[PDB]
Amino acid sequence: SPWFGMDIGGTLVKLSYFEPIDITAEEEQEEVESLKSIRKYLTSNVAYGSTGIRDVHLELKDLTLFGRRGNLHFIRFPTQDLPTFIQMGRDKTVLCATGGGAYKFEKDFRTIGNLHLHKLDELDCLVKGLLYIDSVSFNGQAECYYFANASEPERCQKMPFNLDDPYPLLVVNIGSGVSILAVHSKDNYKRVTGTSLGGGTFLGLCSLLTGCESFEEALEMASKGDSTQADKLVRDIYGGDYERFGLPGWAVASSFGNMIYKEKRESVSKEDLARATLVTITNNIGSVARMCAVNEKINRVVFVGNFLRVNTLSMKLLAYALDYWSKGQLKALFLEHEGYFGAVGALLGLPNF
Template identity: 85%
Template sequence: SGLSPHWYPRVQNGEEPWHPVCCLVPSPAIPMSTLPQLSPETLRAGSWHYNVCLFFFFPILVFPWFGLDIGGTLVKLVYFEPKDITAEEEEEEVENLKSIRKYLTSNVAYGSTGIRDVHLELKDLTLCGRKGNLHFIRFPTHDMPAFIQMGSEKHFSSLHTTLCATGGGAYKFEQDFRTVGDLQLCKLDELDCLVKGVLYIDSVGFNGDSECYYFENPTDSEKCQKLPFNLENPYPLLLVNIGSGVSILAVYSKDNYKRVTGTSLGGGTFFGLCCLLTGCSTFEEALEMASLGDSTKVDKLVRDIYGGDYERFGLPGWAVASSFGNMMSKEKRESVSKEDLARATLITITNNIGSIARMCALNENINRVVFVGNFLRINTISMRLLAYALDYWSKGQLKALFLEHEGYFGAVGAFLELLNSA
């Protein structure tokens, strides 16, 4: 009829904004001037010749925006910091939200164990129509109770935000979130989140640079180069996620992937064994010790058995025949250092992961293997070894690829699910 509709909201101030709103458009037989005088009660009671339309308004996602991945060893958190807040928004913003944003973005460390990886920050992203930066934060899982308590003290529940979480800890700590933090978790599958996170971060890139890279000449310290790799057409790929344990996925498209296999011998095994063998107390300390050690004093090599190469089967003399095999000898046990033991532990775990990944790639007929997970954080030794081993044992058919954001993809996937829910 060309007449302007009159709106009768079915929500009052303070209620959720996504309820339907009733739009009443009068038929031409009823004067438009009568409509504003009618109360909702009158409209419900009478018989009116009105065209009634229902419009559903979806929620505007309330800040703050988080994604959590609560793993067996580390908690990974991503936080979106809006940079386009208007003066009106800032004036209306509650103190709790201002406090949380300031706390997260003005610090690079939280307590004695929480770290914000500033070098991984993604700048000027546009998400749900808002522009801002994505921050990446990690802390040990054993500090999860302190994190929940902090959320309670900062009255996080008053913000009415949704916490999307993945990883086993989303189930383990669900009750604590509810009782201590007064927060309800939205629990998500960790492999779904992992794949979504990898594909998204690779698609947006790393502040203008490539997210994906590989190593050229990985065994030559002088010639080794870290070079960008274009993962624009990623499928199919084998995704090897090395956390406390290892999961290996074959990814054929963004919606078609499967878990091929896994192993319990992962980053948690390396760190745990190093703690036992060397007395170290942090992952960083374990890697530092490994960088100074010589694994050939601990492992038995092919040349230790054959006196050189095992040519018939193409086994070079430097290949490991038996991990920790030299430790059967009392004399050799007494001659090795803690650094040697740490290096041998790192090589053992890395070789095992590389061997399983290679077999999976061959079985699935996939030639690109992408390694992710926090085991690879500051762990150049393992990355270069994986790069060399896959290339050498496949005779150049397999390529090992790595991603800059290593262990944060599950948290990114959970974060994306939060945005999709709106």
């Protein structure tokens, strides 16, 4: 049976697949053609149907797992298209699955005869997956990185970051919504809180406000926008800084607060609204992460989940905001395999079955 781990989220399904590369002569002859065809289909294509994507740049090559050498592949598709994936699965296997859809779609996976579904917790898998990928490294490079001198744009640059002793750690999982975890040891972690203002809020509001049809298009619009056209800033209320409580004139006082004026609503652009949505969501996540960090006494905050994939705007905004508002006490950290840790952690549960 092929070695998959699957994280079925509210929005995206994430799949980790281990391709063995030490297949012996006897093994190659003694494998059933369906097993052969699966491996071939997955490794010879980078688009699967109309919505599956293999993130080739994330592949972990020559990894030793369960005593075999192979390549770890990372694949994603919309949860909306899971029926299609399951239908392909019934054409002519132990599936470790996590995320909410491991429960919601349990009965659907069992339409695949003789398939054994083992459900694993969405956040145990996250923790296990994150610690594992960082421990094996990203093909010899750091899995973890930050933005050095994030306060200064002429200096701000991605730099690797070492997590050899990775405790304690605040993990901020930005999916559809947000889960915040305090990780004290490999076996000791709790969900501190969460927020419902997450990746799905950005995409949903953006679609309502601008008609964008994709996450990527929403980000493209936002990169061309000016969020201060929609937001009311401290200087719009004070005429400058609010010096007494150290609030700079440029801080947002009211997100979308300038949209209470009909004349401003009529002159704001879709790009402006896309950017204000991104900035509003991103700043609220950073602020919540900051309050949790201070309360949990944790100064390393790592952001994961697919809201940040191909999203340097939000990453730089988080790097700069966390550092500025914490007066340099907290560090914003990021991971190359952003959205896949649950899928990896599920795959790692395989020996338990």
